[PDB]
Every structure is written in structure tokens, then in C-alpha cells.
């Protein structure tokens, strides 16, 4: 198993690392039909997504979507910053495939 | 896929973007048989519902409907000031749709 | 669909609204067997419970049902002010049914 | 339906009420194959899990089970005073059957 | 029932306690397919993570998988101290098997 978000993004196809390093400027929910997702932005104009579950994804991945949308709000809500996003980037906005997140009071 | 609130509102008929710029005023949770919803208020005097589960939801749009109700109540609990509230008009009182929230810290 | 609590418990035989206006003083929870419920007491006196899910309630309250249980949790931990409480009197202790909390801010 | 923790504890055999009255000193979770359950302990020395799902447990137990040990990590997390524990003593550290958290109240005993 | 992280480390093949007595330094979580998992590091340099759930585990590890990495996102963003990990040394990065944290005020 990876070690790294970056390692981990450097294993998929059509993925790219963005560093943030930021706290989410915007959250955004939907329960609207066919548009159940979740949409952050940042104060960089930066725009993502945890695109609507579909044939996209296996099983496995249905827990993991859930939970990468129940991070983004706690993350929102609670001002954490966010340190990378491993995200596919031949989706607008990108979706997110990882999040990485970082509290530096020390180093590593 | 939409990259606004705005822009997700504009795909549905019905449908209507409120500018609440504000932290919810009063939440209210019902378990009651048939009446399984949440309304939230704001001072503005504005009132949402996220309806109770039906026959008008689309399979998997369930655990959209729960975490909408789980956000509304954190959101509440933390105070934290609402931005935008996508609304189906067709219902009363209004019910939600999508909600943005912004901080300009 | 209410756009009240109150309006809510209108709708329901034995129902019965509590003006709270006070935070949870004690919170109970049980996993025992047969008693898998909440308590929660004010100290005005009054106690209330998230019955156990019986056969009284239909399969759409299972999840507003554990939803109430996660808001009293919530919103005692939190310290945060109960407004009303929307209940079954026919119950002992009453059961609650609705719940709204309200701030002046 | 039982008011109190105390009388709750009354309806089961087994069980036993410890009067706490402090927060949470250590929390273990464990997701160890055969093993998935959760331990706390008090400054008290008093030590308490809440067992591995099985066959004593019934069906509307796990979920039961499960919001118990929810409530026990933001229990400490949020360093919450625990007040009582309905617990059954024949098991080993003692099982969480019930929890209690009173939340001051200058109106006294 | 083991009462304590290290003797339940000491029922299984393979298990290693580390005392990290420190905060979680960086949190990392994956969505991507077939790389369901989160992966925690602290200061110290050590790297673990709550493995993408396949085999070895069996049926009620489901849900401990699940509430593990609930507890490692908690416990990241609250800063919140963790004493010891139980985890598998035979997996790279070490899979956590268990979790304590204490308080000592």
C-alpha cells in the first residue's frame, strides 16, 4: 500500500496532485436528483468535486465516497486546512480522489 | 457536472436559489410516523423543509437526503452561517434542495 | 408539510407540546436488551425517552428514530438550549416525538 | 419504560450500577479480528468494555452496540464527565449495558 | 476480554504495540478505487494505515474498519494525543489493529 498521497495518486491514470494547503473557502451539498454531490472551492478560484456515485465506481467505493463527503464537511466546518488533493482531472470540476491533510506544528 | 449552486439549481424546473447569507435561526426534527422531516427558520423569517421520504426521491437520492439533515443540523449546532439554499418552490413550506455554505475568514 | 413543531404536533392523537426553553441535564443511554433507548431529564423535573423501536412505528421513522437518538447526544454534549419538545403523553416516560431548538443568538 | 439508569439496572440480572462521576482517563478501540470492541478505563482503576458483538447480543443490540461505543469516544474526546454505568459483572473487564451523564446543576442534591 | 491494548496485541501473530504518545501528524484518505484507505503518519516518521478491507478481515471487521478510520479522522482533526498502536507488521505501511489514547489531565 502506498505510503504517500502523491504515491498513491502516481498508481491511477488521469489523477494529479494539487497542493492546497488551505482551508475550503466553500461548501456545497446536493440531494437534488441525479446531482448528489458535493462541491469545494477555494480562495485560489480552485473547484472540486466528489462527483454523483454511478458505474464509475466498484463497491468498495461506495463507503469511501460517503466518507471523503462526510470529511470535506467536517473539514469545512471545523476550518481545517488541507494540505493536497489527488484529484481526476478529466472531470469538471475535478472529482477527488484523495485528500491529504496536514498539521504542521512540527515537520516529519 | 455543475460547479455552482447556482448552476446545479438551473438544471431543475421548480427550483429556486435563495440568498440566506445566514446562520439558521431555529431547527426542528420530527420522528413522528409520516412527518419524518427537518424544518429549519432564519430570522429573515424564511422556512425550509428537507421533506420526508417518498415516492418523488430517486432510489440512492436516501443518503443524500440523510446527510442534508445531518448537515443542517451540525451546521446548526456549530452556528455556522448559511450562504445560498437551492429550493424546490413547490412545496411548502420550500424544500431544500442543495445548500453552500461559505467562509470568507 | 408543518412548518411548525407545534403545527406537527397538531397532527398527532396523544401528542403533547413542552416548552423546554433549557439544555439536556442528564443523558441516558442503554444497550441492554428490550431497553434499547435514550432518557433525558431537564431540571425542571422533566424526563423524557427515544422509546425502543417497536412495533408502533413503521419502517421510515427506524432512521428518525436513531436520528433523535444522535441529536439528544449531540445537543447535550454540546450544551445547546432545548426549545420545545413535541411528545406522546400516553407514554412513561413520554416520548418524544419532535424536537426544536430555537436561538436568540 | 425504566426513568432512570438505576432503575433500568434493576431489570437485568448480572448487572450493577458504578457511580463514575469523572470523565474518561483511557480509551482503546480495536478492530482486531474477534477482538472488535472498545475498553475504557478511569483514574479510578475501574475498567469497562463493551463486548464483541455475538450471540448474547440480540438484533436491535447492534445498533445499540455500536452508538455505545460511538458515545463512549466522543464521550472522551470532548473530555464529558460520565456520571453512572449499568454494567454486567460477569464478564471480564466489566460490559457496558447502560450509560449516565448529568450535566451540573447549582440547585443541589 | 484483553483489558489492555498490549495484551490484546499479544493474542495475534504478526501484531506490534508502538508508543506513539504523540498527535497525528498528517491524515491522509483515499476514495479511489481499489485504494479505499487512510493512512496516518506522525512526527516520529512512523506510517500506518487501516488497510483497503478484502480477505483477512472477516465479516463484523467491516464495521471496526470503518469506525477505525472514524476514530484516526476524529482524532487527526481534534488533536487529539494517541498513546499506542497495535498494528500488523507485516504490511507495509503497518496496518492498525488497534487504538488507545489516555488523558493524564
Redesign the interface.
Known amino acids: 500500500?502506498?505510503?504517500?498521497?502523491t504515491e498513491?495518486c502516481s498508481?491511477?491514470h488521469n489523477?494529479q496532485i494539487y497542493t492546497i494547503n488551505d482551508?475550503?473557502?466553500?461548501?456545497?451539498?446536493?440531494?437534488?436528483?441525479?446531482?448528489?454531490?458535493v462541491?469545494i472551492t477555494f480562495k485560489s478560484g480552485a473547484?472540486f468535486?466528489?462527483?454523483?456515485?454511478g458505474s464509475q465506481?466498484?463497491d468498495?467505493?461506495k463507503?469511501?465516497?460517503?466518507?471523503?463527503?462526510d470529511?470535506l464537511?467536517?473539514?469545512?466546518?471545523?476550518?481545517?486546512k488541507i494540505?493536497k488533493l489527488?484529484v481526476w482531472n478529466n472531470?469538471?470540476?475535478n472529482s477527488?480522489?484523495?485528500?491529504?491533510?496536514?498539521?504542521?506544528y512540527?515537520?516529519?
Open positions: 500500500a502506498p505510503q504517500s498521497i498513491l498508481e491511477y489523477t482551508k475550503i473557502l466553500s461548501y456545497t451539498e446536493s440531494m437534488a436528483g441525479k446531482r448528489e454531490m462541491i473547484t468535486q466528489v462527483e454523483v456515485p465506481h466498484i468498495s467505493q463507503k469511501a465516497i460517503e466518507r471523503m463527503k470529511t464537511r467536517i473539514t469545512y466546518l471545523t476550518e481545517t494540505d489527488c472531470k469538471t470540476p477527488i480522489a484523495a485528500i491529504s491533510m496536514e498539521k504542521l512540527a515537520g516529519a
